[PDB]
Every structure is written in structure tokens, then in C-alpha cells.
Amino acid sequence: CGKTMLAKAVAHHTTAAFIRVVGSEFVQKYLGEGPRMVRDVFRLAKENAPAIIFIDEIDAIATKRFDAQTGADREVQRILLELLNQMDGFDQNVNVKVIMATNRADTLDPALLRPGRLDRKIEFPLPDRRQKRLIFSTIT
Amino acid sequence: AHHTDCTFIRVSGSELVQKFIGEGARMVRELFVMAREHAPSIIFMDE
Amino acid sequence: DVTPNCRVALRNDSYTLHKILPNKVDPLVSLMMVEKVPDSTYEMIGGL
Amino acid sequence: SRRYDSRTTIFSPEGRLYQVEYAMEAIGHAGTCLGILANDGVLLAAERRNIHKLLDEVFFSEKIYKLNEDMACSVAGITSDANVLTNELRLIAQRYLLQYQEPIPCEQLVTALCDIKQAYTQFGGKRPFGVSLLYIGWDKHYGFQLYQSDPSGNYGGWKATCIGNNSAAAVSMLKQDYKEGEMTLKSALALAIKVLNKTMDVSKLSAEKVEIATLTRENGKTVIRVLKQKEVEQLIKKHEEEEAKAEREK
Amino acid sequence: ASKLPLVTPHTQCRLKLLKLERIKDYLLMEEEFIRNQEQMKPLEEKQEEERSKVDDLRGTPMSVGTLEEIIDDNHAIVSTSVGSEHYVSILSFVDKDLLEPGCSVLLNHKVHAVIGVLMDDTDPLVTVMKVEKAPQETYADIGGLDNQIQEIKESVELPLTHPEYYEEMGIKPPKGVILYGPPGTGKTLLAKAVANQTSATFLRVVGSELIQKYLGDGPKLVRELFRVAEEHAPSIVFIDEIDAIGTKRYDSNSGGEREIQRTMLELLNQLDGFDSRGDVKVIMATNRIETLDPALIRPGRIDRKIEFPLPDEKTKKRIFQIHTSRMTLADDVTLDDLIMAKDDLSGADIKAICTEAGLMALRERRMKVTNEDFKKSKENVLYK
Ligand SMILES: Nc1ncnc2c1ncn2[C@@H]1O[C@H](COP(=O)(O)OP(=O)(O)OP(=O)(O)O)[C@@H](O)[C@H]1O
Numbered sequence: 056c057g058k059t060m061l062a063k064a065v066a067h068h069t070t071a072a073f074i075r076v077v078g079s080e081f082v083q084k085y086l087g088e089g090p091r092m093v094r095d096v097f098r099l100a101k102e103n104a105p106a107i108i109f110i111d112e113i114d115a116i117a118t119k120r121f122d123a124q125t126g127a128d129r130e131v132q133r134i135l136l137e138l139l140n141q142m143d144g145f146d147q148n149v150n151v152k153v154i155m156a157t158n159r160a161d162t163l164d165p166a167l168l169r170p171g172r173l174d175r176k177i178e179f180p181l182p183d184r185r186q187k188r189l190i191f192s193t194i195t
Numbered sequence: 196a197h198h199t200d201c202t203f204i205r206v207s208g209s210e211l212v213q214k215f216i217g218e219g220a221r222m223v224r225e226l227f228v229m230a231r232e233h234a235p236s237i238i239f240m241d242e
Numbered sequence: 243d244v245t246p247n248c249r250v251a252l253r254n255d256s257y258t259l260h261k262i263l264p265n266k267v268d269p270l271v272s273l274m275m276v277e278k279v280p281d282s283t284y285e286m287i288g289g290l
Numbered sequence: 291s292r293r294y295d296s297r298t299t300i301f302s303p304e305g306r307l308y309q310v311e312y313a314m315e316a317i318g319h320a321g322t323c324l325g326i327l328a329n330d331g332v333l334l335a336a337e338r339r340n341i342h343k344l345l346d347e348v349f350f351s352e353k354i355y356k357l358n359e360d361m362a363c364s365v366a367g368i369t370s371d372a373n374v375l376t377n378e379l380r381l382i383a384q385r386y387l388l389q390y391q392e393p394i395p396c397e398q399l400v401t402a403l404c405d406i407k408q409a410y411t412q413f414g415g416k417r418p419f420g421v422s423l424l425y426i427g428w429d430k431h432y433g434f435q436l437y438q439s440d441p442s443g444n445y446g447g448w449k450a451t452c453i454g455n456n457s458a459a460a461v462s463m464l465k466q467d468y469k470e471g472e473m474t475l476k477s478a479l480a481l482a483i484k485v486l487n488k489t490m491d492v493s494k495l496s497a498e499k500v501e502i503a504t505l506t507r508e509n510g511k512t513v514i515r516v517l518k519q520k521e522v523e524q525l526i527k528k529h530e531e532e533e534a535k536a537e538r539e540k
Numbered sequence: 541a542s543k544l545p546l547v548t549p550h551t552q553c554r555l556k557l558l559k560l561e562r563i564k565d566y567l568l569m570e571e572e573f574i575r576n577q578e579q580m581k582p583l584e585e586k587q588e589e590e591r592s593k594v595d596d597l598r599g600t601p602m603s604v605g606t607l608e609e610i611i612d613d614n615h616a617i618v619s620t621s622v623g624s625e626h627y628v629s630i631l632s633f634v635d636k637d638l639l640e641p642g643c644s645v646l647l648n649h650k651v652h653a654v655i656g657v658l659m660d661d662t663d664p665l666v667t668v669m670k671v672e673k674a675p676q677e678t679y680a681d682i683g684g685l686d687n688q689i690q691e692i693k694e695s696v697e698l699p700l701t702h703p704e705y706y707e708e709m710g711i712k713p714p715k716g717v718i719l720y721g722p723p724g725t726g727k728t729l730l731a732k733a734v735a736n737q738t739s740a741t742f743l744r745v746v747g748s749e750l751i752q753k754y755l756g757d758g759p760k761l762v763r764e765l766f767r768v769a770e771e772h773a774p775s776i777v778f779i780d781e782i783d784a785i786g787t788k789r790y791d792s793n794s795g796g797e798r799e800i801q802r803t804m805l806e807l808l809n810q811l812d813g814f815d816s817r818g819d820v821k822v823i824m825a826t827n828r829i830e831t832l833d834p835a836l837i838r839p840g841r842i843d844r845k846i847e848f849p850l851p852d853e854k855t856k857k858r859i860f861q862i863h864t865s866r867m868t869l870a871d872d873v874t875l876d877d878l879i880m881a882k883d884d885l886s887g888a889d890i891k892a893i894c895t896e897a898g899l900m901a902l903r904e905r906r907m908k909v910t911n912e913d914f915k916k917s918k919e920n921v922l923y924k
């Protein structure tokens with residue numbers, strides 16, 4: 056439904072700094088590379104510009120259930136804690152905008168969806184006839 | 196709770212809350228350790 | 243002065259106690275920090 | 291084949307049975323009816339459920355059914371189940387009238403119906419009826435009478451009974467306000483409007499939302515008047531005047 | 541310290557005189573066999589010198605290790621905190637005993653040799669499931685029942701307080717006690733007075749919180765539960781609402797009803813295992829007595845079956861007298877009108893009407909409770 060495509064177009068016509076991360080790469084084999092990998096991105100968004108973070112496949116990190124018996128799950132737990140802190144490390148003065156695109160909203164923590172971090176929710180429903188014919192005009 | 200100065204502690208049954216309550220917390224009652232440590236407290240619950 | 247659940251500074255050669263590290267968190271301050279409830283008051287009550 | 295049988299006839303291990311008690315659970319919802327008398331005449335008050343703005347408002351009654359030329363009933367429960375019951379005992383009164391050429395005693399009519407309701411609760415492997423209804427009527431033997439049917443198949447003599455959603459809450463005030471034989475059929479009307487004022491959770495007492503029928507003995511008629519919607523609201527505001535001065539005087 | 545257990549006598553007996561003077565024999569003779577030590581060979585102090593010789597053997601970096609096996613000739617395989625285990629030796633100040641597989645120990649920093657053992661800070665679950673203090677008042681709070689109070693004192697209290705009556709009879713107490721009836725009839729309220737009465741260690745668990753989300757964590761919680769129950773002493777285990785394991789299905793449990801079933805197999809073991817059980821009494825309560833497994837209700841696993849009927853009206857007035865004892869009752873009220881308000885009112889209904897009537901007095905800042913507080917109190921409590 057143009058989830059990647061709209062970020063391509065905004066990232067093309069933008070004038071600010073665009074930072075484009077792939078949300079299944081924070082699971083490093085080594086400890087700490089994940090959390091440091093979380094914090095330095097937002098540090099570069101801070102120092103760089105009034106910039107824009109983009110995150111895709113959030114279901115790779117933000118799930119609902121957890122298990123403190125594997126370590127592979129405890130690491131992802133520590134991934135979510137870092138970003139959950141760093142979204143609260145803001146003061147409305149920097150213009151750093153976080154765009155996050157997923158496929159399923161079901162496998163998500165609503166603690167991620169609290170206000171102060173997440174307030175704007177955009178579904179991409181299917182066009183039926185009206186916006187449908189416009190896609191035929193553009194592609195044909 | 197804000198006006199009578201109590202610890203407004205809601206529970207939701209999540210698992211990121213879990214690591215500060217215990218390692219497994221086989222009951223729910225292990226929250227009462229923190230609750231009697233903040234003895235004037237109020238527990239809140241959703242649907 | 244040594245409190246349970248408190249950080250410390252430690253030397254490394256003989257593991258001798260050096261200095262008490264300030265503080266860290268309560269296990270509930272972090273909890274409500276994660277939850278982030280919308281703090282309210284009587285001055286935003288609409289007709290109840 | 292016997293794997294599919296649900297055994298709607300057997301008892302519980304605690305002695306009772308669950309089917310007709312589930313029916314008596316279902317009778318608490320979906321209806322509010324009451325009857326009251328102390329003198330010449332008897333009143334049935336019925337609270338209408340369907341209050342949608344597109345109804346033809348016909349058939350002379352909603353939950354009221356004239357049984358004989360001198361008796362009638364207010365019904366509560368599953369209406370479709372009730373439809374077979376109404377014309378079912380109606381020709382039982384007619385076969386009494388054909389048998390003896392005489393109007394039927396109201397009590398022994400109710401026993402004959404409650405036998406038929408009792409049979410499905412007893413054998414046959416049949417889903418019983420979740421229908422409970424009142425009984426009003428007059429005879430030459432005891433005058434005005436009042437009876438109450440239950441989905442189990444037993445009956446009972448009363449004078450004033452509600453089987454509403456707040457039925458016991460109504461009865462709690464029914465035994466708080468009454469007088470034996472002196473509540474004339476205007477005082478029992480004003481009391482009845484106070485009762486449905488209480489158990490009617492929808493306030494302000496919409497006159498179209500209620501049904502009230504009376505049964506009086508005229509000399510050879512037994513007039514079963516079915517009051518129109520032009521004299522309800524004057525009784526409504528009549529209650530409204532005395533409740534305001536009754537409040538402010540206290 | 542456990543010197544002489546003969547403390548019988550209980551008057552001015554000469555045995556008491558000569559026995560305490562013979563403790564004076566072992567102590568006067570051998571206090572003159574305490575003088576000579578540092579008089580002949582001082583050579584150290586032995587109060588701290590040999591003690592600091594141990595403390596100069598063991599280093600200040602005391603690593604904490606974990607046992608998993610024992611070989612008797614003072615060396616064993618111990619677990620490091622990392623996981624890379626060693627094959628170190630065991631010292632002589634290790635008092636070779638308090639050593640079980642899984643025990644926390646003290647190792648060297650250099651060669652990781654077994655220096656000491658560690659006292660265990662236990663687990664919070666014991667403090668969670670362990671009742672600390674007496675809950676409330678005695679059996680006189682109950683009122684009206686008076687028959688099964690003799691039954692619960694019969695099966696629980698009397699075996700504890702009087703271990704003579706069963707021995708003159710040549711008999712053992714009945715094992716399992718179960719309580720059943722309508723809800724709100726005082727089933728937990730009796731166990732409150734039991735927890736007042738007993739001096740044994742008391743445990744309480746709800747039958748709802750047995751169930752889990754992981755596989756086998758239920759039966760494991762059962763096994764460690766009866767482990768905790770046995771590892772103390774005389775104990776009473778209370779189970780509330782055990783029908784709830786069979787009635788309600790929850791989607792947190794990954795296994796279906798054939799995981800609840802296996803939990804019931806483990807508990808079904810833990811009532812009547814072949815093992816030496818010990819002094820653990822079991823008191824249970826429910827209201828749906830007909831739903832659960834009769835294999836658990838058999839004599840041998842539960843011996844005493846106790847039903848609670850509804851309160852009759854002469855017991856009702858007693859319960860009114862109980863819950864209206866210390867309150868400023870205005871003389872406006874008549875309790876007999878409050879008796880027949882509900883034909884099958886529970887004891888909780890009475891207390892609810894009383895407390896809500898007090899709430900109606902405190903809405904109007906008064907001190908006494910009047911009749912209309914009860915009149916609208918039964919409307920508030922009962923009719924909704
Ligand atoms: N016979 C009684 N006399 C006085 N008070 C009673 C009586 N029965 C119950 N109560 C009161 O009602 C309350 C509820 O009783 P209790 O908790 O024993 O009900 P229950 O049958 O154990 O319910 P459940 O077992 O389903 O939790 C108690 O706090 C108690 O004070």
C-alpha cells in the first residue's frame with residue numbers, strides 16, 4: 056500500500072537530514088552493540104540537523120511477549136528500553152521526526168503507543184474504485 | 196492519588212514491567228513487596 | 243551507611259571498598275516511567 | 291445417535307434440574323408486567339419494550355390477551371412461545387363453555403394450562419417454555435381473582451405482582467404500600483404509576499411506552515376496558531404534581 | 541548450649557541440688573582445667589591468631605561459586621559464576637556437611653579452591669505465600685454455626701494442642717479437610733479464625749493462581765510449594781477456590797485442559813505420595829463442589845467433608861448483633877424487619893448493608909445510623 060514508497064517520496068523531496076535504518080539490524084551477536092547502536096543514531100540525529108529517523112519492520116523489535124530465559128530475548132528487551140528512554144530524552148526544541156512503518160499493529164506493545172512518544176497513527180486502507188482508477192491512470 | 200499523595204501504580208500484565216517485579220513472578224502477589232514499601236499506595240486496573 | 247540495593251565504587255587489585263555510588267532507581271520509578279500515565283488534577287475535571 | 295441427546299429431562303446431582311431454572315433465568319429479562327387490585331376491577335400494567343419510531347401500533351394490545359369474555363392475561367417471556375399458549379388455553383375455555391355451557395372458573399383454567407406446561411418439564415425430551423404470565427378474571431364464586439404462572443408449571447394466588455426486570459425490587463415496595471380491600475381502582479392506579487415510575491429505569495414515563503388494561507364487573511358485561519393513550523399522561527402528571535409538593539413539603 | 545535436658549523436678553528437690561552441683565563439678569574441676577592453656581604454651585592467642593591464620597589463608601576477593609557434585613577426598617567440581625567449572629580442592633575449615641548440589645559456596649580468587657559456604661537468602665516466594673501475623677478476631681466473631689467449629693478444631697486444633705487423646709486411643713488424625721457451600725457463607729472467614737488460633741506455620745494459596753503460562757511451571761510450582769510446606773515443621777496449607785482451575789479457561793496457558801490435567805496429576809500425587817509426608821495439614825474450600833475430580837475427594841486424600849448451609853433467621857439476628865456491636869445504633873431500627881428482607885441472604889449481605897448504612901450516615905456527618913439508612917441501604921446493596 057505504498058508504505059515504503061511514501062517514505063521514498065518524502066525522502067526524495069525532503070530538505071532536512073534523512074536517516075534510514077533497518078529495524079532488524081539492532082540484534083547484534085555481541086552485547087552492547089545493540090544499545091550503543093540505538094543511542095548513536097539519535098545522537099547523530101541530534102548533532103546533525105533537524106533530522107528524520109525512519110524505522111521499518113518494528114515487529115522485529117517491539118513485540119508483546121518476553122522471556123528472561125534465553126538472552127536473545129533479554130537483548131531485545133534491552134533494545135526496547137534504550138529507545139523507550141531516548142524518545143523521552145527530547146524537549147520539543149529539536150525537530151527530529153520519527154517515522155515508523157509496520158505491517159501488523161497486533162504484535163506491538165501499547166507502552167510504545169503512549170502519548171509523548173506515539174500519537175499519530177496512519178492506517179493504509181485499500182482503495183475501492185475512486186482512488187483505484189487514479190493508480191490506473193498513473194501506471195498506464 | 197495525585198491529590199492524596201499515593202503511589203498510583205496501575206498493572207497491565209505486560210512483560211517489560213516484569214523485570215522490575217521479579218525474574219518469573221509466579222504469582223501477582225510479588226508486587227506487594229513494592230506496594231508495602233510505598234505503603235500509602237493505590238493500584239489501578241484497566242478492563 | 244551501607245544500604246542494601248546500592249551501588250559502590252570498588253578497587254580492582256584487592257577488591258577493597260572505595261566509595262558509595264549515589265543512587266540508581268527505584269524498581270517502581272522506572273516502572274511508571276515506562277508506563278507514562280497522563281498526570282491529572284481537579285482543575286481538568288469536566289463536570290463529574 | 292444418543293451422543294447428540296442433551297437429556298433435558300434428568301435431575302442434577304444436587305437434586306434440582308437446570309433447564310427450567312435457565313428458563314426462569316431468562317424470564318427475568320425482556321419484559322415488565324404487574325397486576326394489582328383491592329376492589330371492583332383489576333389492573334394490569336405492562337411496560338413496552340419496542341419503542342422504535344416506526345411501528346403501526348395496532349392489534350389492540352401488546353402483551354394483553356383477552357381469553358374468555360370475562361377474563362384476560364398479561365404475558366411475559368418469549369412472545370413466539372406465548373402465541374401457542376394464548377390460543378391454546380383459549381379453546382380450553384371454549385371447550386369448557388361447549389362442555390357445560392358456562393363461563394370457566396379462572397383458577398381451574400390456570401391449573402389446566404399449568405399441567406400442559408408441566409408435562410414438557412416432566413418427560414418427552416422437550417425444550418420447555420420460558421413464559422410466565424399473570425391472570426385476571428371474574429367469577430360468580432369469588433369475584434375478581436389474580437393468578438401467576440411460572441415456567442416450572444406451578445401457579446399461585448396473588449393480588450399484586452410484578453415479574454419485571456426489577457421484580458423483587460417492585461415487590462419490596464408493593465409490601466411497603468397497599469391496603470387490604472380498600473385500594474380502589476384509582477388509588478391502585480396512582481400507586482401503579484408510582485411502581486412503574488420506580489422500576490422504569492427510563493425516566494419521565496413515556497405514555498406510549500406502557501400498557502395498562504382494567505377489568506371491571508358490569509352487571510352482565512365484565513367490561514375489560516383497554517385505556518387509550520389520552521388518559522395515561524394526565525395520570526402521569528397527576529403523579530408529578532403530588533410528588534413535587536410531597537417532596538417540597540418535606 | 542544443649543548441655544543437659546533434665547529440667548523436670550519443679551520443686552526444692554535434692555536431685556536438683558546435687559545435679560546442679562555436679563554441673564558445678566564438671567565446671568569447677570574443669571575450670572581448673574581451663575586455667576593452664578596460655579600459662580604453659582602461649583605461642584599465639586588462639587582467639588584471633590589462628591582465626592586470622594584462616595583469614596590470611598582466604599583472600600579478600602571471595603568469589604561466590606555453586607556446587608554440583610561432591611568427591612569425598614576434599615576436592616569437587618564446582619561451578620563458576622561464568623559457567624566454566626573447575627576441579628578445585630576443598631579446605632578444612634569448610635565443615636564438610638552444609639554441602640549439597642546447588643549450594644552457594646565461597647571460592648578462592650587464585651586457585652578457586654573451596655574456602656567457605658554461604659547462607660542462602662532463600663527466595664521471595666516463601667515470604668509471598670507465607671502469612672506473617674494473625675489476621676483477625678477469634679471464633680467468637682463467627683456465631684451461629686457452632687457445629688463444624690468442633691469439626692475444624694477436631695481435625696486441626698486438637699491434634700496440635702492435645703497429642704494425648706489419639707495415643708490413648710491408638711489412632712491418627714484425619715488428613716484432608718474440605719469446605720463447601722454457597723458463596724459468601726464464611727468459608728474463608730473460618731480459616732481467618734483458624735489462622736488466629738494456630739501456632740503452626742500457615743500458608744494460603746488461591747486455586748486461580750495455580751495456573752501458569754509456561755509448560756510444567758504449574759506442577760513445578762506444586763513441587764516447590766509442598767517442598768516449602770514440608771521444609772519448615774508443623775504446617776497448615778490452605779487452598780481457596782479450587783474449582784477455578786477447572787471452570788475458567790484462559791488464553792495465557794499455552795497448554796489446554798490437558799495441562800491443567802497434568803497439574804491435577806501432580807497435585808494428586810502431592811496429596812497422597814508414597815513419600816513420608818510429615819506434619820502438613822490441608823484445608824480446602826470451594827463453592828462448586830460438584831465440578832472437580834472425585835479422585836481428589838476420596839477418603840485418604842480428603843477425609844472430612846464439611847458443608848455450610850445458608851444461615852437460618854435466628855442465626856441471622858445473631859450475625860446482625862455481631863456486625864452491629866461497636867456501632868452507635870440509634871433505636872429507630874428494628875432488626876427483625878431487616879431479617880426477612882431477603883429470604884436467602886448471606887452473612888456478607890448483612891455486613892455490606894451495615895457498612896453501606898454507615899456510609900450513608902457519613903454522607904450526612906451524623907454519629908448514629910437511622911432506619912431510612914437501612915431502608916435505602918437494602919435498595920443499594922440488594923436491588924440493582
Ligand atoms: N456465618 C457468618 N457470620 C458472620 N459473618 C459472616 C458469616 N459468613 C460470612 N460472613 C462474612 O462475609 C464475608 C465473606 O465470607 P467468606 O469469605 O467466608 O465467604 P466464602 O464462602 O469463603 O466465599 P468464597 O469461598 O467463594 O471466597 C466475611 O468477611 C465474613 O465477615
Ligand SMILES: Nc1ncnc2c1ncn2[C@@H]1O[C@H](COP(=O)(O)OP(=O)(O)O)[C@@H](O)[C@H]1O
Pocket residue numbers: 280286287288289290
Ligand atoms: N471532565 C473532563 N475534563 C477534561 N477532560 C476530560 C474530562 N473527561 C475526560 N476528559 C478527556 O479524556 C481523557 C481521559 O480519558 P479517561 O476516560 O480518563 O481514560 P479512559 O478512556 O481510559 O477511561 C483526557 O485526556 C481528557 O482530555
Ligand SMILES: [Mg+2]
Pocket residue numbers: 058059
Ligand atoms: Mg514495505
Ligand SMILES: [Mg+2]
Pocket residue numbers: 724726727728729
Ligand atoms: Mg470467601
